[PDB]
Symmetry: C3
Subunit: 608 residues, 3 copies
């Protein structure tokens, strides 16, 4: 069946991923979008794009009728579901078949047979794959470790495997770092591991990519857990170690062609790692965070370094969709070298505007047990104390660099003003800070954490700066240069030279260097701060848009700080609102079952 | 023999092609040029360039004496003849040898022995290659099909073949689409096909590239037709399937080195296609057209996509030289995928200023029998009904996009004017079209073919546009962005988003999208049109510069519309001038045997 | 041992070379610098950089204590010594080991055992490698052909070789052109040659790269000369023929990993050449020259063409450090093709501001005996007659091109002035040189060598120029275009078109074309030349900063021109100052043992 036009029934990075390969093959691409995704990267990337309705996925990306209607209207011969949404929906895959549209994935029978745990285990046990597990009175025989096999099938029924991936490093089951191949598994053991899975794949004559998830013990005995009837999120680590494009194979096999390479042809070189980037706050129990990507600098990409990004600077993460920002994958000759490359690369990644898991991934990828390959499903719970750590006071050299950056920003502003003046060469336009027969010393104040740091900066005739912090003096000289769109600060402190990325947003100075990142706060004059800002806040504002599940306060009720007022469920996450003050409650703005928008007043308190 | 400097005794794409490889090898390059080619791409590309006289090729590129004189003056050790001109001239190849200059091609004996059909057939029959043919009482035993083999020989006499190419798709013998390998020929059959040709190549000890042209029947029996004693035009499809550079091999073998790879070393991967871009009007019986390349946008080039272009935007096609504009070749894993890639690529190619065969190539490459590989030499005559088709009325969405493009062009002009004004931020400089307490509705008229379309455009406050055509309303919003040197229009009509290349030349709006290309005409106000433009045209103007072969009208003769007045031959193509009016002939400006320049008055008619 | 941070205990190109590979592997890089190197390319290239004191290498790059202190302060786990300085210092390698820092090189024992000729010969003779030599009463059998083998060892003791390199083309033992493989040595002979060296490498269990230097006779008998216990300067020719990175192997092996590829895996393809760009004057007996790199244009780099440059335009060569400017290496399918590519590339290299050996390398690489591969250690002395040649008078076409370049520079200046004027379209701003009813003829004078050339330039209406030199007239037309940062002149003289790089510095016009380079001097008006410039120069100025070893003149002494006044040693090179005039000596500014700075007056002569 000639696939010349494909509809991508998904959004974000996976839609861009599929479109890349479709365009590389000369296949025309159709995007779908919600009202919230109208300006998304996958819409601009497609050859055609169609609106499927409002921002909630139940009314857009999960609306089978709208997706089929767009596939008909665009004359797309095939639908690529990507991952999540309709990719594991049996009714949607059968509807595509009824409508004469090629579903690029497994048959509706394989989706249904794998969607029910008891059914899937019974099929896997009958296929030879082990079916042991701990179930409710529930105590898992083998709780630790997670190892999965990429398997590929065809309409013909021929089946192949692609080694294995370690996904043991998970937080609340959510996979965080994936690696391929899984460390410490012998080529012989993995070959046997895949072959038992391959027989099951032939048994269901699975067509398209499938993944057999195994639980592996400390002795490398493995048992079947489940089969994900889709492309996995972490498929890039497999692609990096095999040199295959799994989406390209999905399109070819959905068109009816046989598997491109024999098992003998497949060869393994090197090791690869993947670390998903998540709009989460690790310090606040990995709460998801929504907000703008005010800065989104990225590491330069090379064949080893792949940035799977569906978002661009200025994009806003949405409460409706998944919080992932990007996925970073690397390939290297050795696993240790790959770990080193990922950590250097992570430092180059910069995200300002919302909290992310990047610093958590840096701590995790540098943990001694992770470096050793001693991974299991409880790794994050077990090493929670080390993986999460507090801020430490900055060094005086960092403060000197921050002051130099502020001074250079002022100099740049002066040059910008000079550009538009008729007098372009007046000595007054210089930033020398020069005086007659004396030297100018500037008293600057910077805040590091809660500490105010006083810096005495002296403008030298030669153009350097002498900075004194407490009893120590530093000789500082540097300049600003631009690489791409990022301003870089090149400075030398007491003869030590270094380079860092400088961003000054609001009253915070951001310095990004391969050593680390430091934030310094510029004190805000009181006058500029609004004097007498409005007081008497009206109750904690809803953490997010969610249904009100419980109300504990009547119209007039005396409450003390810490008295629960309301309970709200948002995206299946319970939050309890607590009393800010000991004041009696004047009124309540919401009742039980009401949906309250983010940051909307919940309770009114009597003025005291 | 050390070839450190080569003269290229040719022009256009083939001169650039040879110079590319010569420069890649560190060989110095000498161009020759006519007065008409002084600013041609191959002149600017060479390390040295020499004038060889006036525009007619008989007095320039065919002047053996001038080419030899330049080779001596530039101290070029070798001459590369390319294809056409002196490449198959035996006297020129012998003259190069007499003058101690290396002719990069076959020996003068092989050129002469292949230049006479009876001689070439007798040699081929004696070499085992089959001699059958239909000749005058002429009825070809096998008229259909044209399969040819790339063969390479050396001074040593070793000979190799490079699979085969299908050139069956030809119009008036002129090859139009070529493919390699030829579809439906088995690897075993082609191996035998090449081996019989190889024995003939050894028999004439042919040195340099040669092509054995075969006629193949529906049973895959093949018979020798002729041997072209040169590099073929369509050699790039062979290079794309073998990974060889045939010009590089020609230079090495002309220097005296042995063939680089053994027959065992040669391997075949994938399939490739080549389409020739011709300055022709398919709707007017494929008449050649001369004129400026006002726009010459091209598809981006990748290793699979090769643009063999000797012309650049603003170049003028010449009546003296060949009308080819460029050749497009693609390589793919499968032949069907290659056909898809070529068609997508052809849409990206844009040519404005003269008629081309590109839309004919798009229809041909999408014909069901061509997709099946059911090709033969009569394919174009047999399918002429479908391959050529009429214009169809445009959709209302296309008209909306054209109106949006016109409005955005006006906005860009407004911004350009604003740039030079002292009031850079006045609200008047906006293109909002805003009114107080009412909405501005603009009545625009556009011409699609012969139909005038009335569009009522309403300027909305948000910046969008509401366009009404007949009884249908469309919500239109978009903007202009630049990629390279091409302006692109990004628009959304009724929620449907699309991208297209926008060009507004004279009174025509050109919209190029992967769906297709649409031209919309902006009506020309009568006042601007010169009122009372001069009437009484003096006879049809010569279609081109050509000799007058016949005159049918005396100084005073009464003629009726359709009465032939004169017959003119131009580049061996007969045109008969016909009487425009029933008026009696006042005078004749030319007599028989005179050469009449293009667009010069031929007959004077009495004023009535 | 995990090497995540490396200190590079070197400067210039080799520091940049090591940092390239370290950064490619994700290893952090620490530079060291002297006060003179504060702005050097390797300082800006490193992730961290530290000052090691003043410009003299004895107080900076040879200060073991400072290098170890920086390695400790930066927390570098390893030191890469590069080549020269501390790379062959046994005490430094032992000090690194005592301090727990990985020395990236051979063990201190191997450095010491190879540093003494008698010890090294005794070890080599015991290892089977031949010991024969001519020693003092010192004489040899025949002129040597220098052939050396790249050998690599590991801590395990496994040893491998990498074919061989010809370094026979040397001036005063200084290697000038190196090639790999060495021409005329059979693969079998080289295999045996390497194997005898490999046994010695195993005998000292050498770890890291080593080179066994052999003397080879005209019969290809070879004898051990010495073993350089470091990376060789000319290692890039080996890398180009093997496809290996020897610095990458040095880092891996210093970390403790086994050799990456087996001897069976290693394969040889093509041939490669390396020429060293020296700041030397070949015409003045290859005296080293210090000064600014005012222009440093370079050939474009491709995988075959590697520019190993540690200097950038505007960099100043230093008296303290080595005079090398850059090293040029090429790889080709054949040795003859590689020689052609290097010569074309050398012409593209442009160096203005100091004398270089580039024209000497062009003459050498084009010498018939060098083209034949008839090289030996006396090649430069034997052929000194041809390799060094005088300037030849320029052709009239070159003078025409120079005049055209001057005129176009004036036109560019006129356009620059016009840019800032309110009247931007006045006809006066044109450079037509037009007159009413007559033609403007300009009398220009240019100096070629010692000859003044009078050129009569006539400004034609069409924009061309008619230039008459003596009795010959030339029709000249051209324009200026910019490629990158280099201005190019495109001109046509009497119908002959050519391109050249144009630079006009001070009063000299530099024209660079693949044919050659020509300098034309613009006469300096007398008035602008300072009239009555100060006379009575006070003795020859010190050729460079050096100790005064001898003084031959008392406070009042009568001397005649050519009477030696003082002897000075600079960087171990004796210069004798001679009397400029027959005047009696008024005074002496220096005594014996004093250090005299460059260009400082040495003797005062009585006014006459
Ligand atoms: O409803 C959305 C998915 C997660 C909650 C569904 C719960 S989990 C406990 C119970 N068992 C099911 O199979 N579904 C619900
Ligand atoms: O003259 C130019 C080439 C085409 C016309 C030549 C004609 S074709 C009929 C006749 N037979 C030849 O061999 N030449 C002429
Ligand atoms: O001093 C610097 C190196 C070159 C000069 C050293 C001289 S060469 C003659 C004598 N023999 C040595 O081993 N060193 C000195």
């Amino acid at each position: 069946r000639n696939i010349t036009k494909v509809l991508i029934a998904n959004r974000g990075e996976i839609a861009c991923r599929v479109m890349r390969t479709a365009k590389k093959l000369g296949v025309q691409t159709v995007a779908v979008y919600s009202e919230a995704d109208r300006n998304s990267m996958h819409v601009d990337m497609a050859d055609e794009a169609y609106s499927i309705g409002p921002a909630p996925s139940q009314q857009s990306y999960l609306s089978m009728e709208k997706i089929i209607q767009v596939a008909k209207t665009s004359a797309a011969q095939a639908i690529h579901p990507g991952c999540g949404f309709l990719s594991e929906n049996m009714e949607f895959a059968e509807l595509c078949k009824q409508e004469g549209i090629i579903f690029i994935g497994p048959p509706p029978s394989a989706i249904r047979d794998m969607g029910i745990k008891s059914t899937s285990k019974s099929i896997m046990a009958a296929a030879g794959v082990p079916v042991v597990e701990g179930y409710h009175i529930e105590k898992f025989v083998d709780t630790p470790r997670h190892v999965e096999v990429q398997v590929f099938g065809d309409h013909h029924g021929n089946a192949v495997y692609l080694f294995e991936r370690d996904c043991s490093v998970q937080r609340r089951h959510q996979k965080i770092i994936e690696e391929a191949p899984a460390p410490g598994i012998k080529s012989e053991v993995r070959k046997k591991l895949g072959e038992a899975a391959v027989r099951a794949a032939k048994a269901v004559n699975y067509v398209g990519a499938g993944t057999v998830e195994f639980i592996m013990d400390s002795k490398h005995n493995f048992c079947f857990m489940e089969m994900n009837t889709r492309l996995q999120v972490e498929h890039p680590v497999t692609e990096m170690i095999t040199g295959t494009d799994l989406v390209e194979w999905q399109l070819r096999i959905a068109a009816g062609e046989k598997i491109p390479l024999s098992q003998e042809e497949i060869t393994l070189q090197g090791h690869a790692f993947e670390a998903r980037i998540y709009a989460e706050d690790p310090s606040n129990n990995f709460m998801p965070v929504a907000g703008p990507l005010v800065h989104l600098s990225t590491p330069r990409a090379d064949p080893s370094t792949r940035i799977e990004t569906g978002v661009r600077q200025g994009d806003e993460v949405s409460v409706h969709y998944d919080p992932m920002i990007a996925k970073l994958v690397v390939w290297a000759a050795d696993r240790q070298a790959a770990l080193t490359k990922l950590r250097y690369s992570l430092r180059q990644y910069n995200i300002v505007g919302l909290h992310t898991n990047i610093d958590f991934l840096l701590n995790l990828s540098g943990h001694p047990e992770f470096e050793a390959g001693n991974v299991h499903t409880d790794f994050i719970p077990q090493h929670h104390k080390q993986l999460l750590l507090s801020r430490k006071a900055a060094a005086k050299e960092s403060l000197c660099q921050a002051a130099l950056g502020l001074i250079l920003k002022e100099k740049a502003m002066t040059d910008t003003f000079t550009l538009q003046a008729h007098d372009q060469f007046s000595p007054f336009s210089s930033s020398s800070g020069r005086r007659l027969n004396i030297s100018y010393t500037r008293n600057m104040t910077l805040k590091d954490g809660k500490n105010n740091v006083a810096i005495a900066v002296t403008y030298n005739h030669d153009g350097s700066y002498s900075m004194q912090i407490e009893d120590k003096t530093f000789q500082v000289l540097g300049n600003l240069y631009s690489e791409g769109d990022c301003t870089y600060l090149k400075c030398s402190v007491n003869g030590v030279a270094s380079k860092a990325k400088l961003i000054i947003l609001e009253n915070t100075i951001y310095l990004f260097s391969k050593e680390g990142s430091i934030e310094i706060d510029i004190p805000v004059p009181k006058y500029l701060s609004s004097v007498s800002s409005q007081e008497t806040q009206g109750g904690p504002l809803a953490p997010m848009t969610g249904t009100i599940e419980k109300v504990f306060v009547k119209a007039g009720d005396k409450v003390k700080a810490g008295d629960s007022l309301m309970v709200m469920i948002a995206m299946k996450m319970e939050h309890t609102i607590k009393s800010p003050k000991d004041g009696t409650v004047k009124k309540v703005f919401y009742r039980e079952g009401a949906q309250a928008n983010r940051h909307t007043p919940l309770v009114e308190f009597e003025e005291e």
